[PDB]
Amino acid sequence: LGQCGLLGTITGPPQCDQFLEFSADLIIERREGSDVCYPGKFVNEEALRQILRESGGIDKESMGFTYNGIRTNGVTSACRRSGSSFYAEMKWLLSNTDNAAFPQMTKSYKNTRESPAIIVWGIHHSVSTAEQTKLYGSGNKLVTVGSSNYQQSFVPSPGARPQVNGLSGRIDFHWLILNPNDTVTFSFNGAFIAPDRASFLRGKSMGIQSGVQVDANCEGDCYHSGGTIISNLPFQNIDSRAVGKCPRYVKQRSLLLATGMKNVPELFGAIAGFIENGWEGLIDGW
Amino acid sequence: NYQQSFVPSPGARPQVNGLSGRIDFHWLILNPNDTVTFSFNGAFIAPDR
Amino acid sequence: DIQMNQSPSSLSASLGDTITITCHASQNINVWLSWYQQKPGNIPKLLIYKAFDLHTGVPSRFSGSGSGTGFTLTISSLQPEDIATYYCQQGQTYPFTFGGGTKLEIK
Amino acid sequence: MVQLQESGPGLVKPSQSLSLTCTVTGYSITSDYTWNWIRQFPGNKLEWMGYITYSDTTSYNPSLKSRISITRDTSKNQFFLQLNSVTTEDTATYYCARSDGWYGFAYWGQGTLVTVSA
């Protein structure tokens, strides 16, 4: 994934664009992988990063949402492909005109496949009460997200923040899982980063964190941050957080074996016993 | 040892057995000779025993 | 170079029919196809970007679809001004490529 | 409403220099989008050839990089291609555009049919 961050493959920030619908038996993510473009984070994101590494890719399907009396062309300068762009899977909704309002809306998506989906939506934490009155509008803001096993009723939290890459706002991306023939109804009066294409898991994979280069001539199975472990040895001193079909981490740095005899230079006492000595006379056996 | 200040979250939900509302049941533990004061202006499913 | 083989080069239909046509790009261009309406004698103009979104100003009965390798626009309720050559744009890599086009007539 | 206009004389002999010059009224080139030029064949086959950005960088078609120079000017609000080593095959119509790129090719122009002949 290189400069893509593995949670961006369901959002599509401008470096994950070659990656939106991948399919892999080995996902690789890098230290420079920034999951976002607009600065922010995913809430409960280590549960989400542990779904995706063993998922075998993601097979996006449309959610069929249409939107009315509303603009959906929201972009920002921090997300660049050739111009001011946005995410590939999400929709920065806004107002129609800048200071009238945001009309109240409600949508719903019924899972109709066999597999469980992964929804991911977003709440936008603006910098002030002067920008949510110009992005979305006056009044309070509310984003209820409900299914058969779930409701949370999120809300933004504006305020002044430290800049990371020029902007002082955030976006938190939350996520649930729908089961077959369920629904999620989203009602929201603003401050919402709607999805446009939900995701369905394809198969199986593993996931590794690393910082070295890809080598398709080598054939290996146990992968850590500085590379790949390959032997039949049960114990490894190399890295404790080695994932895959990895050997077991240990503290000490050498453990041994033999083939045969304790050595004599020239539990019954046979090696140097009453036959007290050795040879170099015969040279095939012992 | 405890205060939380809960609040409901209304909205449209998928039906499970005909109804589209929910009830969340929370719980604490009192210690000997303690108290729980409940103040509430609605949306509350009080206990009785 | 990523080739766009827009099939077929010619198709005619009646007013109110449904037509389904394929822009088939050679490699994976995940959501980056942008399709263009050439009137004969007038400039091309944008109708669909990011494979999904209507450029605001066009009437609503356009609906582009498909994803992946093969892509598809549909027109239900054909109208007599819909005589055009519908060009499609690859937008994953450099260099850009266009395609051969198609011919749509009133039969 | 954005509207852009080309200018240029309509004759060129092989291996000469004919320039293409696009002027944009009302909107600047420093706000961040790229500016492509697009080629139009007899038989309405099309190819792209290059662009200049808001940020002074160039990138061209990998069959044509030895032929193209794109530069741009601010007091005229203009962007500038001069195409050398021409051939009679290159009879084409050249469309200048505010090209959004990954959002497609947003604005177009009327386009000028120029002729290459002996």
Numbering used by the authors:
A (entry chain A): 52 to 317, 328 to 347
B (entry chain A): 200 to 248
C (entry chain C): 1 to 107
D (entry chain B): 1 to 118
What does the paper say about this structure?
The hemagglutinin (HA) protein of the influenza virus is responsible for receptor engagement and is, therefore, one of the major targets for studying the virus-neutralizing mechanism and screening neutralizing antibodies (nAbs) against the virus. After binding to the host cell receptor and being internalized into the endosome, the HA protein of the influenza virus is cleaved into HA1 and HA2, which are covalently linked by a disulfide bond. We resolved the cryo-electron microscopy (cryo-EM) structures of H7N9 hemagglutinin (HA) alone and in complex with the nAb antigen-binding fragments (Fabs) and identified the HA head-located epitope for each nAb, thereby revealing the molecular basis and key residues that determine the differences in these nAbs in neutralizing H7N9 viruses.
The 1H9 and 2D7 engaged sites are located on the side of the HA head and their Fabs point nearly horizontally from the side of each HA promoter, whereas C4H4 binds to a site on the top of HA and its Fabs extend obliquely upward from the HA head. The most parts of 1H9 and 2D7 Fab binding sites are overlapped and span the RBD and vestigial esterase domain (VED). According to the van der Waals radii (< 4.0 Å), the footprint of the 1H9 Fab involves 13 amino acid residues, nine of which are in the RBD, whereas the other four belong to the VED. To engage the 1H9 Fab, the 130-loop of HA protrudes into the canyon formed by the heavy chain complementarity-determining region (HCDR)−2 and HCDR3 of the 1H9-Fab, forming a spatially favorable position for binding. Seven hydrogen bonds and one salt bridge are formed between the residues R140, S143, S145, and D77 of HA and D33H, D108H, W110H, N30L, and W32L from 1H9 Fab. There are 10 shared amino acids between the epitope of 1H9 and 2D7. We found a unique G144E mutation in the HA of SD001, which is likely responsible for its escape from neutralization. Glu is negatively charged and has a bulky side chain, which created a repulsive force and steric hindrance with Y34H of the 1H9 and 2D7 Fabs (interatomic distance <1 Å).
